[PDB]
Curated annotation (Swiss-Prot), chain A:
GO biological process: rRNA transcription
Entries under Gene3D superfamilies matching the protein: 2.40.10.170, CarD-like, C-terminal domain
Keyword Cytoplasm in annotation: no
Stated family: Belongs to the CarD family.
Superkingdom classification of source: Bacteria
Protein name per its UniProtKB record: RNA polymerase-binding transcription factor CarD
Extent of the signal sequence: none
Keywords (A to Z) from UniProt: Virulence
Organism: Mycobacterium tuberculosis (strain CDC 1551 / Oshkosh)
Curated annotation (Swiss-Prot), chain B:
Protein family (similarity comment): Belongs to the RNA polymerase beta chain family.
Protein name: DNA-directed RNA polymerase subunit beta
Assembly with partners or alone: The RNAP catalytic core consists of 2 alpha, 1 beta, 1 beta' and 1 omega subunit. When a sigma factor is associated with the core the holoenzyme is formed, which can initiate transcription.
Domain of life of the source: Bacteria
Known role: DNA-dependent RNA polymerase catalyzes the transcription of DNA into RNA using the four ribonucleoside triphosphates as substrates.
UniProtKB/Swiss-Prot annotation, chain C:
Motif Interaction with polymerase core subunit RpoC boundaries: 114-117
Family statement drawn from the similarity comment of this UniProt entry: Belongs to the sigma-70 factor family. RpoD/SigA subfamily.
Protein name: RNA polymerase sigma factor SigA
Sigma-70 factor domain-3 as annotated region, ranges: 169-234
Entry GO CC: cytoplasm
Lineage: Bacteria, Bacillati, Actinomycetota, Actinomycetes, Mycobacteriales
Keyword tags: Cytoplasm, DNA-binding, Sigma factor, Transcription, Transcription regulation
Role summary: Sigma factors are initiation factors that promote the attachment of RNA polymerase to specific initiation sites and are then released. This sigma factor is the primary sigma factor during exponential growth.
Keyword field contains Transcription regulation: yes
GO molecular function, one term: sigma factor activity
Region (Sigma-70 factor domain-2): 90-160
GO biological process: one example: DNA-templated transcription initiation
Keyword Transcription attributed: yes
Assembly and oligomerization: Interacts transiently with the RNA polymerase catalytic core.
Organism annotation: Mycobacterium bovis (strain ATCC BAA-935 / AF2122/97)
Swiss-Prot record, chain D:
Gene name of this polypeptide: rbpA
Entry similarity comment: Belongs to the RNA polymerase-binding protein RbpA family.
Keyword Transcription regulation: yes
Keyword line: Transcription, Transcription regulation
Name this polypeptide is given: RNA polymerase-binding protein RbpA
Originating species: Mycobacterium tuberculosis (strain CDC 1551 / Oshkosh)
Portion of the parent chain present: 24 to 111 of 111
Domain of life (superkingdom): Bacteria
Length: 159, 49, 245, 88
DNA sequence: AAGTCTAACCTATAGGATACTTACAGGGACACGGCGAAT
């Protein structure tokens, strides 16, 4: 699944690091829990290797995904009605899904609508959080000075 | 069980005769009715309570 | 033991008790009533709208209208009564749900039963503006209206010092942000953090905090406070008027 | 004291009512008395209160979200159902 | 300086639609109610 020190994408948390796979003989079987660490508060997760793919253990997308999401965020004309509830729930679901393209589409939409008027309080926090995770995975895929990563993200997003 | 565990104490055999109640289910019914006025008694609820 | 009879006679005798707890009492007032079926609720709403149209048609034709037939009049009056009883039954079915969602704002501000009744009013407004043309669950639409009503009433009746609804909104917003900021950082957030968070000058947070303050009952103990709460000038004013004399 | 008089009204339940003012003022058309509801003069003026239409009513709520034809259809359906119930 | 004349701000009302159905001492005294003989 992964060796020691690999980089892993575990949504909705995003980037994480694996250190080992301790096989906890609990339940009479050595549960190959891949010990994993995150960056938010150094939380530790023990994911069974038997169902690692089920819980969402995966890798950062290659540059093909990067160019695909570049095209996705370049695309205008994403419409929306007057209300707020529809987009709020939609972006909640698509951010909880641990996807790269849809998070980019929703963050682009929210960026442009904020730049137009300025919406609310908590949606600014969600915009920030989405931008942070996108920058983190971009730096992870490119290893490109995450401050530089967010600067270039802003540059391409502004277009 | 109560009688055999205690074959000597007059007070408790007197209580057994004068308890005027028969059945563990009936005892639970009485206990539930007393401790839960207004509640429709039922045996599983009585034992769990 | 179901039809054990005795076992149900005990239940009936227990149903006829004094009982003084009002929250328990209302728990049993809706106790007698049951739940509802979605499609049954659709038909209920249909009957409600039909009876409503009937009564308004009566009111419109009441002036310079027509001498309606006895059978027609009887049937339309019956439809109107059926609609009223239908909405009563619908509300009776929904009392359980509104109670179940009103139990989540207890322990604060006002009485739980008070929350219940304000939620009941919100429920009446929800049925007042319920649309079943798409045919979705009534409860999901309702929750928004009941929560709206109870939040309104909480805001209007929270404190002895009346504050506008906008201020209730900014205050509970301030409290929520304060709580989560403590949860993340663990250090007391400075007022300037809130000032920049909401994009305001360094005064709004102070005023909002001062409004948020709860009055302290003069009744207290340690002896109540009211006892310990606070002739030169009066004598002087009389003397000065005389001095002018 | 200042030249002062008393303005005259009457509340709806008969009781003739009265509240003081100064002579130099407008004796208003309307006043909320001590009993607790609005009243007006028995003197003239008669400012024609002209009450506003009610905030809201269940009918107009159904109006902005429904029309006449489908409600007529529901009314007819109920009518024929009840007619079958009574006489068949 | 109140009397206008001008230009904001603030708030009671209202409105949005997955789903969710039963909370959380002690003492004296009197009045409301067990146990027994009589008709």
């Amino acid at each position: 699944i992964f060796k020691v020190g690999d980089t892993v994408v575990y949504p909705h948390h995003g980037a994480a690091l694996v250190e080992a796979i301790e096989t906890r003989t609990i339940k009479g079987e050595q549960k190959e829990y891949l010990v994993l660490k995150v960056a938010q508060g150094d939380l530790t997760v023990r994911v069974p290797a038997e169902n690692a793919e089920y819980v969402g253990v995966r890798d950062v997308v290659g540059q093909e995904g990067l160019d695909k999401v570049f095209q996705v965020l370049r695309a205008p004309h994403t419409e929306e009605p007057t209300n707020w509830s529809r987009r709020y729930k939609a972006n909640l679901e698509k951010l909880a899904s641990g996807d790269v393209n849809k998070v980019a589409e929703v963050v682009r939409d929210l960026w442009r609508r904020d730049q137009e008027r300025g919406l609310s309080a908590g949606e600014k926090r969600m915009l920030a959080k989405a931008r942070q995770i996108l920058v983190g995975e971009l730096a992870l895929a490119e290893s490109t000075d995450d401050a530089k990563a967010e600067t270039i993200l802003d540059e391409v997003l502004a277009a | 069980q109560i009688v055999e565990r205690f074959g000597f104490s007059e007070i408790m055999r007197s209580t057994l005769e004068k308890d005027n109640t028969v059945g563990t289910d009936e005892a639970l019914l009485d206990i539930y009715r007393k401790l839960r006025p207004g509640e429709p008694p039922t045996k599983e609820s009585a034992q769990t309570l | 033991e179901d039809e054990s009879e005795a076992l149900r006679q005990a239940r009936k005798d227990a149903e006829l008790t004094a009982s003084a707890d009002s929250v328990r009492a209302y728990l049993k007032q809706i106790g007698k009533v049951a739940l509802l079926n979605a499609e049954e609720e659709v038909e209920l709403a249909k009957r409600i709208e039909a009876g409503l149209y009937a009564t308004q048609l009566m009111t419109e034709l009441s002036e310079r209208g027509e001498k309606l037939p006895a059978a027609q009049r009887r049937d339309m009056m019956w439809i109107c009564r059926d609609g009223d009883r239908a909405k009563n039954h619908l509300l009776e079915a929904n009392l359980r749900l509104v109670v179940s969602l009103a139990k989540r704002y207890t322990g604060r501000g006002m009485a739980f039963l008070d929350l219940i009744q304000e939620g009941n009013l919100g429920l009446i407004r929800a049925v007042e503006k319920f649309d079943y043309t798409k045919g979705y669950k009534f409860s999901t639409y309702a929750t928004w209206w009941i929560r709206q009503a109870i939040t309104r009433a909480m805001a209007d009746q929270a404190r002895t010092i009346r504050i506008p609804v906008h201020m209730v909104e900014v205050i509970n917003k301030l409290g929520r942000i304060q709580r989560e900021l403590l949860q993340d950082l663990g250090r007391e957030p400075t007022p300037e953090e809130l000032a920049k968070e909401m994009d305001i000058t360094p005064e709004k947070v102070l005023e909002i905090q001062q409004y948020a303050r709860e009055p302290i009952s003069l009744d207290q103990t340690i002896s109540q406070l009211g006892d310990f709460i606070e002739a030169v000038d009066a004598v002087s004013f009389t003397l000065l008027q005389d001095q002018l004399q | 004291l200042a030249p002062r008089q008393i303005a005259r009204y009457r509340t709806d339940n008969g009781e003739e009512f009265e509240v003081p003012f100064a002579d130099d003022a407008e004796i208003p058309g309307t006043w909320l008395c001590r009993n607790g509801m609005e009243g007006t003069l028995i003197e003239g003026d008669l400012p024609e209160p002209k009450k506003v239409k009610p905030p809201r009513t269940h009918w107009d709520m159904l109006l902005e979200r429904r029309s006449i034809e489908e409600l007529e259809e529901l009314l007819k359906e109920r009518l024929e159902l009840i007619r079958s119930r009574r006489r068949g």
